[PDB]
Structure formats: C-alpha cells, structure tokens
Amino acid sequence: MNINEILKKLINKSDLEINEAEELAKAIIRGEVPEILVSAILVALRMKGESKNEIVGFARAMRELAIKIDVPNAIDTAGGLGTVNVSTASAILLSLVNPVAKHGNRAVSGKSGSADVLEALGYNIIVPPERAKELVNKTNFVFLFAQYYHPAMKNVANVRKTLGIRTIFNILGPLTNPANAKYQLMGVFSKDHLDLLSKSAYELDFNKIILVYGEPGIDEVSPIGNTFMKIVSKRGIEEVKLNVTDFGISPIPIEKLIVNSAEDSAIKIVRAFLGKDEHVAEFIKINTAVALFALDRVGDFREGYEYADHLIEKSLDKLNEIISMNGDVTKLKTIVVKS
Amino acid sequence: MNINEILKKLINKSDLEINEAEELAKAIIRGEVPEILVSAILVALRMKGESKNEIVGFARAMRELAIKIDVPNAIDTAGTGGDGLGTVNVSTASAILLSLVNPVAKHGNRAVSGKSGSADVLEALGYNIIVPPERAKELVNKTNFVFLFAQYYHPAMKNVANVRKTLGIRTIFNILGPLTNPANAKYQLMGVFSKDHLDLLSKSAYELDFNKIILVYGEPGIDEVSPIGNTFMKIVSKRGIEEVKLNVTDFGISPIPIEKLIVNSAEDSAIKIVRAFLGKDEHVAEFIKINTAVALFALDRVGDFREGYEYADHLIEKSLDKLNEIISMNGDVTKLKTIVVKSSG
Ligand SMILES: [Mg+2]
C-alpha cells in the first residue's frame, strides 16, 4: 500500500484494481494519507476518468466504515435545476407498501436537500441507529442522515472543501446506503454516469437497483420527456428507454416543478398530497411508479403510475404518523395550513 | 488571480497564458497558495501536459525571484533530470573540462534518487556547494567555475518543497532548473528526459532569451548525449531552432557499454570521474568527452562534433589539476585527495 506508487500509476492514467482502489479508499477515509496526497489522488482520479473498479473499490471502502443498521428488505430512492424533492415525497408513498430507508443529506445548492425538506415538515432528521431500526418497524420509514452515518468522511472534508470540484466521492453517496437496502431507485446526473455507475453497481451486490437519468438533465424520472434507465440485478444490466407519455400523461411544465427553498418544496409536496397541485403530484407518481417496478409490485410503468395514484391519496396521513412518531407534528400542521 | 478558476481551467485541460502561468507561479512560489491547491494544480498541470506558455510563465516567475549574479558569458551544462539509470554525473565532470576554456556557472541540486545529484558529487569531491553570491562571482574570476546550488539561489522554492516531497512525482518544476540559471548564463547545454519535451522545451527556450542553448535527448532515454546510440538535439538561438540527429559513432568512437556508466552513490560517481581524469576509465572518459564536445560546439569553439570530441580529449588531460585548484579555492582538498587514492592513481 504505497500511495506514491498509486499516484504515479494514476498520473500515467492506469486504472486500479478493485482491491487497490478499496485499500486506497480505506486509507484516505481513515485519514492515514496526507491532505496533499488525497488532493493529488482525487484530481488524478478525475482527470484519468474513474473506472468501474475504482468506483466499486471506493464504494466498498465506504460501506465498510459507515454506521450500519440492518434492513436489506428496505428500498431507498437515491440521488442542479432546483426541482422539488421528489425522491423524498416518493419515499413516503412507498412506505405505505414497503419499508423505506431513505439515505439523504442537506443541500449545497440552496435548501432543497431531502434532509432540509424533511426537517421543514417537522421530521427530526438525526436518528440514532437503535431508534432508526425501531421507527422502520413502527412506521415503515426512516431517514438516514448521511453526515450522521459516514463520520469517517470528516477526514477528506478539508480536501473536498478546499478543492471545490467534483471528485469520485460525489458519485458514491447513493451507492452507500447505511441500511444496506437491496431495493433502490438511483438517479444520476449524466448519461455517461448511467453506464459507469450501473456497471459499478453490478458489483456492489444489489437485489435490484434502477439507475435513471431524465431530460432535460436530472437525477430523476423525466417529467418532460425521455428517461434513460439501467436495471441492475444479480443476473445483469438491462437498458430501458422511456418517455413521460408511456405513463399515460402529458409532459409536465418544468416551470411548475421548481422550488426556491426547503419550505417551498414542502408546501408543493403537501399540496400534491392534498390534490391541490397535480403537476407536482404527477412528478411524484411517475417516479414512485419506477420504484414500485423495482419492487416487483407492478409489471409495467403504466400499472406503476396507477398504483401510485392510490398511494398518494393516503400519503399525507402517512406523513403525519411518521413526523408525529419522530418530530414536531405542529410544524407539519402549519405547513398544511393551506400550504 | 483566482486559483480555483485556474484549477478548474486546468482540470478541463485548457492551457494557460504566459501571464496566467506566471502569476500562478509567483503565487505558489511566494507560498500564497495552500498546499492542497498547489498539489492539485501541479497534478492537473502534469496530467494535462504542460505547454510552452506554462513552462515560460513558470520559468519567468522563477527567475524574477531568484538570487542572481551576473555572468551571462558563462556556460552551464544542465540536465532536465529523470528516472534514468542512475548514470554518472557527466554534466558536472564535463563542466570541469569547460572551465579550462570558458567561465562555467553550473546550476545544480542534491537528489532523492540514491545520491546521483551534481551537488552531491561535488560535495563528495570536497567542494563547498554553498557559495554566497558575492564569493560566487569571485570564484568564477579566480577559477573560471562556480556551482550555484539551487536550494540556495532559489530560496523562494522552500514554499513548494513540502508538496514536491510529499507528492514524490515529476511536476513542472523538475524541468525548470536549467532554464533558471542564477547567473543568467547565455550559453547552455540542456538534456531532456524524453524525445517529447525536447520540442516543447526548445520552443519554450526560444522565448527565454538565450544566445545559444542546446537541448538533447539520448538513447536509451537520458538527459544527456547518448553513449550508446542516437542523440536528438535542438539548437536554439536568436534566429531560430535547428533539429540535429546524431549517433555516438559520429564522434569517431564505438558505443560505450551502458553498464560501465552507471553509479550507485555520490562517492562512486566521484571515483569514476577522477579515474577518467587519470586515464584509468576510458568508458567514463568517452562519456564525458562526447558531452563536452557538444558543449564546445555550443560555444562555437569547434565546427563539428568530431572536432569537439578531439578538443575535449586535450581538455580532460588537464582536468584533474583544474579540479584540484577549484576545490582548493573553495572546499576541502584532502577529501579530494582521498578520492584520488580511492581511484587508484
Ligand atoms: Mg433524488
């Protein structure tokens, strides 16, 4: 395990082995490598172009140092333009029919982060591992706040912050779900990452994970047009192109799906749960639809959309019980107040 | 002057402007940029592939901040350095023959690769490698030779030391030394580690204001004139850049077995050198002469390399004495003597 060997290897643009990558990651995460080297390695790593094995190596290193809870039977809706936080809203409909272990963080792009939205609704986003398991059984849903679960990460913080650029770590979050959930919907920000991250995921041991990229470029199912997804399972990777019409609806005006703050997102969500905002509701449903498909609850996406319609109608109540059993219900009520 | 802008620019593989490069260098050298960023910039710089302008920018930033002495009439034999074969320090031995016929301002440094640095060899022979600027000028007049220890005339460099050391890889700085001679040397024989840089650095040098500088790359891959085969050189002057291929035979000798030119320590290099000055090691001596030959050519003392080789033969015969006077006027002569005893005699 010689950093300098590795660094030179990377500069020479030579991909690493899953093992090389994993050891290097462990070291970096454990804070055993000097800031100057981490900086250099990440930069080289990016300029060379991270490869599947390296993604896998790092992913494995990550999982190994995180605080874990066991709920592999759970599903997660993994993760810009500033759209309302669908994944989260969507995690709520899902909790009605299956345990949900939502991995998430605040945002670095103006309040919109799933942790912020939840915090806005009154949810107490800091859930200790012990009570986490409890909540999942008691309500079928729990939020795993990333900062609280990847404490080892602090050792790379300074470098990441100082560099202020995209490193390999930026695409690891969604592949490092604390609860080890086997069922998951994962959004990526670029088609390239679709292929890359899918192949990477194929080796991270998943029952079923669906990666998706939607026009005009979002880490979610496209509300306006084509959505490109990679279905990864124990037996391979399947490509699947899709159009928002295939759900049986007409394209949603992107203008309506955008938010400007955590509370603004919350309101748009709750309004959708009330039937006061069809656009947002449809956005939440085409996404939940794909997730339902990942759970094998439906056979086609149209079926999935339909099912989701039934779910959304019971979602505000579900949300209420979730927040009430871990958070401030009133903050939720004030948000309900026509908002 | 925003580092982060630059960094991103580099990551996106976009070459900088001589000015951009120069300001960035000044900042880094002045130690105004955090270690994490210097590390990132150098790495990006290398993975993108440094360009002429960047080389120039950094070179200018360096000079501007170096401690200087004035001896442009001097010549220097610098090597871009490399991951070569731990070869004997020819440039240095060769600087000695040159002092016989022209002032020599040898730029040089220690080394992390064993102990094969020109500063180490000189230190081994008894030379006092730390020469203050004032006495430096003196020594050059008194003996026609002086060694400018990089760490000492480029004190600003300390600010990038930690990063360079920690990284432990080739950065843009590794190819700046020879282009930043503290004496402003107008004549220079500069050896590049790859046929590539050869062109890059030549074009770069064309704008650094030189009377005549000859860059060279020799098989099987050394920052010196090839003792085994073809040597590729770029002759840069006020009126252009000339390409010149050459073979070790064009000197009138048969290829030297690389095995004989390799060393394992500063003292080992010294001995091999002194032995060559005694006539006890032809292989090393021939290595020293084909190089000195090219340098002589850069000085316009000869018209062809064969002539240069011949002239060098005459020079080497008076070199041990010259070396003696150099060390004796700035160093420990005895250490030199013990080395003379160790190299038979
Ligand atoms: Mg999301």
Ligand SMILES: [Mg+2]
């Ligand atoms: Mg050299």
